[PDB]
């Protein structure tokens, strides 16, 4: 019983670490996507100007 509980503790520790892993990666993805969306907004403006 004690060994199983210790194994459960270790499992939850790794799960938490990995969950934090997912979170940082996701926040970076959103940041980069906001920056790239904006570069594409700049692209959109020049395409409009070139149309005129």
């Amino acid at each position: 019983i004690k060994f199983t509980k210790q194994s459960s503790v270790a499992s939850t520790r790794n799960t938490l670490k990995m969950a934090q892993d997912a979170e940082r990666a996701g926040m970076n993805t959103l940041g980069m996507l906001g920056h790239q969306s904006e570069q594409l907004n700049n692209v959109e403006g020049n395409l409009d100007l070139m149309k005129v």
């Binding site: 019983i1 194994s7 939850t12 969950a19």
Partner: protein, 44 residues
Amino acid sequence: GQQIFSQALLNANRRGEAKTALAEVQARHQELLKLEKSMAELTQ
């Protein structure tokens, strides 16, 4: 002029208490392993 010893029986409730909660902790551990596996895939 005489004396006597004494023996003892455990409580019925106890029963197989070694695994009364061992099965339960093992089942929860299996749940936690499933959780860990899913989190690993999500992080990937």
